[PDB]
Amino acid sequence: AYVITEPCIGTKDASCVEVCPVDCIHEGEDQYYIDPDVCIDCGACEAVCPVSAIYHEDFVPEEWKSYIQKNRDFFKK
Ligand code: SF4
Protein backbone atom coordinates (compact mmCIF):
# COMPACT_ATOMS: atom_id res chain seq x y z
CA ALA A 1 0.00 0.00 0.00
CA TYR A 2 1.14 3.57 -0.88
CA VAL A 3 0.95 5.98 2.03
CA ILE A 4 1.48 9.60 2.99
CA THR A 5 4.57 10.97 4.69
CA GLU A 6 5.72 14.12 6.47
CA PRO A 7 6.41 16.32 3.33
CA CYS A 8 2.71 16.58 2.32
CA ILE A 9 1.93 18.09 5.79
CA GLY A 10 1.21 21.82 5.34
CA THR A 11 1.76 21.46 1.57
CA LYS A 12 -1.77 20.07 1.95
CA ASP A 13 -2.80 20.04 -1.77
CA ALA A 14 -0.99 19.72 -5.14
CA SER A 15 -2.94 17.38 -5.63
CA CYS A 16 -3.14 13.57 -5.87
CA VAL A 17 -6.82 12.80 -5.02
CA GLU A 18 -8.57 12.61 -8.43
CA VAL A 19 -5.98 10.35 -10.11
CA CYS A 20 -6.63 7.30 -7.88
CA PRO A 21 -8.55 4.35 -9.49
CA VAL A 22 -10.13 3.55 -6.08
CA ASP A 23 -10.39 7.24 -4.91
CA CYS A 24 -9.07 6.28 -1.43
CA ILE A 25 -7.41 9.66 -0.70
CA HIS A 26 -9.31 11.27 2.19
CA GLU A 27 -8.61 14.44 4.18
CA GLY A 28 -7.37 14.54 7.77
CA GLU A 29 -6.35 17.39 10.07
CA ASP A 30 -4.21 19.38 7.63
CA GLN A 31 -3.10 17.10 4.78
CA TYR A 32 -4.78 14.17 3.12
CA TYR A 33 -4.32 10.55 4.12
CA ILE A 34 -4.79 7.37 2.05
CA ASP A 35 -6.39 4.01 2.88
CA PRO A 36 -3.40 1.72 2.03
CA ASP A 37 -5.46 -1.46 2.37
CA VAL A 38 -8.00 -0.22 -0.19
CA CYS A 39 -5.11 1.19 -2.30
CA ILE A 40 -4.06 -1.58 -4.71
CA ASP A 41 -0.27 -0.87 -4.73
CA CYS A 42 -0.24 1.23 -7.93
CA GLY A 43 2.24 3.79 -9.35
CA ALA A 44 -0.10 6.59 -10.55
CA CYS A 45 -0.24 8.89 -7.51
CA GLU A 46 3.45 8.07 -6.72
CA ALA A 47 4.50 9.60 -10.06
CA VAL A 48 2.24 12.67 -9.78
CA CYS A 49 3.00 13.58 -6.13
CA PRO A 50 5.82 16.20 -5.82
CA VAL A 51 8.99 14.22 -4.92
CA SER A 52 6.66 11.22 -4.26
CA ALA A 53 5.64 12.39 -0.77
CA ILE A 54 3.35 9.37 -1.18
CA TYR A 55 5.81 6.58 -0.26
CA HIS A 56 5.25 2.84 0.06
CA GLU A 57 4.65 1.58 3.63
CA ASP A 58 7.89 -0.45 3.56
CA PHE A 59 10.09 2.32 2.12
CA VAL A 60 8.53 4.74 4.58
CA PRO A 61 11.17 5.36 7.29
CA GLU A 62 10.50 3.81 10.74
CA GLU A 63 10.08 7.40 11.98
CA TRP A 64 7.03 7.66 9.62
CA LYS A 65 5.82 4.03 9.94
CA SER A 66 3.81 5.86 12.66
CA TYR A 67 1.97 7.88 9.97
CA ILE A 68 1.41 4.70 8.00
CA GLN A 69 -0.24 3.14 11.03
CA LYS A 70 -2.17 6.47 11.30
CA ASN A 71 -3.41 6.27 7.68
CA ARG A 72 -4.50 2.75 8.51
CA ASP A 73 -6.11 3.82 11.82
CA PHE A 74 -8.04 6.57 10.04
CA PHE A 75 -9.97 3.91 8.06
CA LYS A 76 -9.42 1.02 10.49
CA LYS A 77 -11.09 0.19 13.79
S1 SF4 B 1 -1.14 4.17 -5.26
FE1 SF4 B 1 -2.85 4.12 -6.76
S2 SF4 B 1 -4.43 3.01 -5.74
FE2 SF4 B 1 -3.04 3.72 -4.31
S3 SF4 B 1 -3.63 5.65 -3.49
FE3 SF4 B 1 -2.23 5.95 -5.17
S4 SF4 B 1 -3.40 6.09 -6.98
FE4 SF4 B 1 -4.72 5.23 -5.43
Ligand code: F3S
Ligand atom coordinates in the same frame (compact mmCIF):
# COMPACT_ATOMS: atom_id res chain seq x y z
S1 F3S C 1 1.84 16.53 -1.87
FE1 F3S C 1 0.15 15.68 -0.70
S2 F3S C 1 -1.73 16.36 -1.89
FE2 F3S C 1 -1.04 14.39 -2.64
S3 F3S C 1 0.05 15.08 -4.47
FE3 F3S C 1 1.48 14.61 -2.67
S4 F3S C 1 0.27 13.51 -1.25
